[PDB]
Design a protein around this ligand. Structure first.
Ligand SMILES: CNC(=O)c1nnc(NC(=O)C2CC2)cc1Nc1cccc(-c2ncccn2)c1OC
Ligand SMILES: CNC(=O)c1nnc(NC(=O)C2CC2)cc1Nc1cccc(-c2ncccn2)c1OC
Lengths: 257, 257
């Protein structure tokens, strides 16, 4: 379970984006600043998948995971009330500052992403949506002697409710076993996100057509090596088609530090 | 003197604000994150008050004073290359977080500002523009987190070069004797101490130039702070007799107890 929010406590403001089956808005919680994830009109299947995500996030506590205030369930409306994170999604930032993000900064982001993912591994919980967009910058770490500070977002509508078409869109982040749930899928996610971070918010296959994406996974191909050997080995280990072959986050965090 | 920065070394980024006769931009220095204070096309005396400010800031070193990198000369425009601090101006932050800033937080900021201002007093060096806006937050310190870490900015185009209209615009922070010495920063400190107490809202801010000037001409005194721990300190500071204002050595001593 998750905390219930009455429609009278939440105010909608600026549209920020569009998630899988959702529309992201800025909002107020009665007045604290929040983000409202408004689920589109849906079957009970999708509403339940949205609840599992709120629940996963509601029963966790880590310094590098966004907080969930609860869910507001009305007539045809489901709104996840979540933490507003100052500088927004990392992928957008990495594109804005393309060619000007040092290796040291990216490395911190990776340690923080893996610290957050080691905690869900030990509690045998699956995030299932690791990508640049779901990494939020609480602190930019642009000034000397200041490091970036991340906050991994809620995974949105759970993978179990998405269609093949929607799963194909999640490539290169989607684990190949997930194309047709284990914690090993977040190892593929962490891996494809390392690549996205190295290539300054430009993930491999991102421009490719759904068929070209689907074919790459069907033909069992592998993603490019990054432009920094500081992560080249770690990525090859994570981005293996064999789930059992992927390193544990305990191992990853060791391989980083 | 000060360092000469070529325009090849700098990169102008997003605009942050406007000062007296300047436009403030975020930027890069070849690679550090910097703040570029671009002076408007100016006459040799204005540019000299700008060069004098660069010089003051260049030839001083203090933990709680922002760093000046050098000066660039791009056609009619002069660029003061300064330090980028993580959270920017303090007034902006106090207004944003009004009614959520503990007295302790305000007292750490006060001492830190008195330290910077004592350093310059032992050096017999005036600032001339001590106001909330010229208080930069390197560490936010809410909550706890460790406590805040401010940096007093450069004062921009020196007072001496400004007009009556510009000097009036600096009320309530402008010392009354400066409307028609190191004593002026004691008023500036006092006026800022009110600004910090009233959560970034200074007295006379929203008033007309004639109302502001009239308040000073009629020798009218500013409000008492809602912070009782500062009532006497600011009363001693915000006096119309420069010689009746305490030294920063005294303010610091008093602040500890
Ligand atoms: C848990 N809190 C959050 O997720 C969240 N928090 N803060 C911000 N702040 C901001 O943006 C700041 C203004 C810059 C944005 C956030 N989410 C967000 C914004 C825009 C698009 C998406 C999206 N979601 C799924 C698919 C695609 N995009 C999205 O969710 C990740
Ligand atoms: C010496 N370095 C600086 O002054 C300075 N350094 N860092 C930040 N960081 C940021 O903001 C980053 C976004 C967090 C802001 C800074 N200055 C600043 C920002 C915006 C407006 C002004 C202005 N100056 C005079 C009058 C009115 N406004 C201004 O100068 C004080």
């Amino acid at each position: 379970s998750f905390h219930r929010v009455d429609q009278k406590e939440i105010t909608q403001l600026s549209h920020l984006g569009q998630g899988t089956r959702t529309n992201v808005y800025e909002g107020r919680l009665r007045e604290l600043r929040v983000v409202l994830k408004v689920l589109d009109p849906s079957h009970h299947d999708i509403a339940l998948a949205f609840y599992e995500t709120a629940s996963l996030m509601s029963q966790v506590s880590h310094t590098h995971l966004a907080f969930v205030h609860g869910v507001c369930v009305r007539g045809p409306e489901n709104i996840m009330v979540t933490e507003y994170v100052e500088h927004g999604p990392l992928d957008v930032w990495l594109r804005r500052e393309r060619g000007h993000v040092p290796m040291a900064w990216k490395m911190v982001v990776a340690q923080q992403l893996a610290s957050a993912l080691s905690y869900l591994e030990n509690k045998n919980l699956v995030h299932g949506n690791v990508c640049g967009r779901n990494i939020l910058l609480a602190r930019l770490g642009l000034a000397e002697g200041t490091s970036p500070f991340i906050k991994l977002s809620d995974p949105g509508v759970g993978l179990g409710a998405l269609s093949r078409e929607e799963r194909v869109e999640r490539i290169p982040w989607l684990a190949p076993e997930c194309l047709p749930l284990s914690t090993a899928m977040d190892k593929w996610g962490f891996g494809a996100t390392l690549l996205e971070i190295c290539f300054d918010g430009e993930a491999p296959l991102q421009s490719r057509s759904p068929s070209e994406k689907e074919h790459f996974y069907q033909r069992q191909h592998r993603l490019p090596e990054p432009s920094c050997p500081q992560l080249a080995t770690l990525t090859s280990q994570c981005l293996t088609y064999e789930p059992t072959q992927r390193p544990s986050f305990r191992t990853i965090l060791r391989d980083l530090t």
